[PDB]
């Protein structure tokens, strides 16, 4: 499916990097 | 009616099979392989092994012309047409041509409204030869195109119906046959045609059922030389049913015993990468022991290739019927 863009992609990146 | 649809679905399935198997053709169980594939040879190297351009020329090459040097001839005629000034009617005057013999119907054509356009040929243009012209497929049409089917060619102010041969456009001296015009890359159509000195545009059309011409190809006339050759490549495959240390027993290649002997000096290759050499038949059923550089997997399949030099067909029809106006289906 489609990739999120803008603030949402950076939020997903931050969750993938620092949360776990 | 429905037999055309059956043929179209058959051609679709044939294009699918020739896409997913590159050149695989089943061995006939009734006809001897040394007879059905009699005019075939095996090559250790497809790229570097030589091949005589003048070996086994057919009757049709007795009907065409050849160039001792095409590049020098083209430079000579272009220098003559650019520098020299022939004593004739030159540009600007409204002239009237007395041309000797024409069919009458051409005159009637001008009475409906069809434009009548003439042009003076260069020297050596009217002579027939072999034209190799590189083409690429337009995305609007994806119907299958068999290699030896008739197509309408627009090449350099000249329209004619003819049957080409499709081969790959590579950097080698010989090019493998493509029996279907693949709709991703640029291939080469080889045809018997009047000599046209490049550059010129190459439009290919398919005669549809309703009279419309469907656009298939587009491109430039690459060269006019009969020394280009098409190479048909045929795969025979079989099952290595007994695998030992660098020595295998393979079935499903042949069905006679001397068919192995006639095709003995042809080296073998497999789908997983190793090569092999034919040692000796078992007997009477085509089972045969091969010498391999490495071990074979049970799921591996042993293959060999047969090569035959292929030349186009004499299908040059200079009459192109007038289409109906085109419409989107």
């Amino acid at each position: 499916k489609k990739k999120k863009t803008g603030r949402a992609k950076r939020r997903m990146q931050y969750n993938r990097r620092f949360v776990n | 009616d429905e037999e055309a649809e059956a043929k179209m679905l058959e051609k679709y399935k044939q294009e699918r099979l020739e896409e997913m198997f590159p050149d695989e053709v089943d061995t006939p169980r009734d006809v001897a392989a040394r007879i059905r594939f009699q005019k075939y040879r095996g090559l250790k190297s497809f790229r570097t092994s030589p091949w005589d351009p003048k070996e086994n020329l057919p009757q049709d090459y007795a009907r065409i012309f050849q160039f001792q040097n095409f590049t020098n001839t083209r430079k000579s005629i272009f220098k003559e047409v650019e520098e020299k000034e022939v004593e004739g009617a030159e540009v600007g005057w409204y002239v009237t041509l007395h041309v000797s013999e024409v069919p009458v119907s051409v005159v009637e054509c001008f009475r409906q409204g069809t434009p009548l356009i003439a042009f003076s040929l260069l020297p050596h243009e009217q002579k027939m030869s072999v034209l190799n012209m590189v083409v690429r497929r337009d995305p609007g049409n994806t119907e299958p195109v068999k290699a030896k089917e008739e197509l309408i060619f627009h090449c350099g102010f000249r329209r004619f119906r003819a049957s080409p041969l499709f081969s790959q456009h590579t950097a080698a001296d010989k090019h493998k046959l493509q029996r279907f015009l693949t709709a991703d890359m640029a291939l080469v159509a080889t045809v018997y045609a009047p000599i046209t000195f490049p550059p010129a545009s190459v439009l290919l059309f398919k005669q549809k059922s309703n009279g419309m011409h469907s656009l298939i190809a587009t491109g430039h006339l690459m060269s006019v030389d009969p020394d280009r050759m098409v190479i048909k490549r045929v795969v025979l495959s079989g099952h290595p049913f007994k695998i030992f240390t660098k020595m295998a027993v393979v079935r499903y290649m042949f069905f006679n015993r001397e068919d192995v002997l006639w095709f003995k000096p042809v080296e073998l290759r497999t789908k997983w990468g190793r090569r092999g050499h034919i040692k000796e038949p078992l007997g009477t059923h085509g089972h045969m022991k091969c010498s391999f550089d490495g071990k074979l997997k049970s799921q591996d399949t042993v293959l060999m290739n047969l090569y035959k030099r292929v030349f186009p067909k004499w299908t040059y029809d200079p009459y192109v019927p007038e289409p109906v106006p085109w419409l989107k289906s």
């Binding site: 603030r7 950076r10 931050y14 | -």
Partner: protein, 180 residues
């Protein structure tokens, strides 16, 4: 000749070294922590902080009773206090060199909407502000980067024409209520 102005600025500076793991992780930390959109907003706040620190340092090179130092240092300290970054008790130039990017990032309207309880997250705060749901003292604000002053802190209310505020329901609720 035209009656037009040609004066403009860039509000950020691209980093001199594009790829280093420390700065990339720090910027990703800030973007995730404050719900920012791109590295450009982080760089914009970095550029403002760098300009303030450079002005403070050049003032600090001056003599203690320079009239320019007194006047402009008082002005800079008063502005930094006014936007809520410095305390009223830290009004000294040296303390300006102790400021971080995180203070200026807290004083934004997105962070103040999240911290005041108007939004359930920082991304909810950004969406709420951008959708004309947030007002400051009477004034509907559409800018998430609106730097809130201390005197505007107690007047962030929630836009009297907004559905969750004054009460006219939106497109979705009105459309669903007409089905049945």
């Amino acid at each position: 000749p035209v009656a037009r102005s040609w004066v403009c600025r860039k509000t950020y500076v691209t980093p001199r070294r594009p790829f280093e793991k420390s700065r990339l992780d720090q910027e990703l930390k800030l973007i995730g922590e404050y719900g920012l959109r791109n590295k450009r907003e982080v760089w914009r706040v970095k550029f403002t902080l760098a300009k303030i620190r450079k002005a403070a340092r050049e003032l600090l090179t001056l003599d203690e009773k320079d009239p320019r130092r007194l006047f402009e240092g008082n002005a800079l300290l008063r502005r930094l206090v006014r936007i809520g970054v410095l305390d009223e008790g830290k009004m000294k130039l040296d303390y300006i060199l102790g400021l971080k990017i995180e203070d200026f990032l807290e004083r934004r309207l997105q962070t103040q909407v999240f911290k005041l309880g108007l939004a359930k997250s920082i991304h909810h705060a950004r969406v709420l502000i951008r959708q004309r749901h947030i007002r400051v003292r009477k004034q509907v604000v559409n800018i998430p980067s609106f730097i809130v002053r201390l005197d505007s802190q107690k007047h962030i209310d929630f836009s009297l024409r907004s559905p969750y505020g004054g009460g006219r329901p939106g497109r979705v609720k009105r459309k669903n209520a007409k089905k049945g």
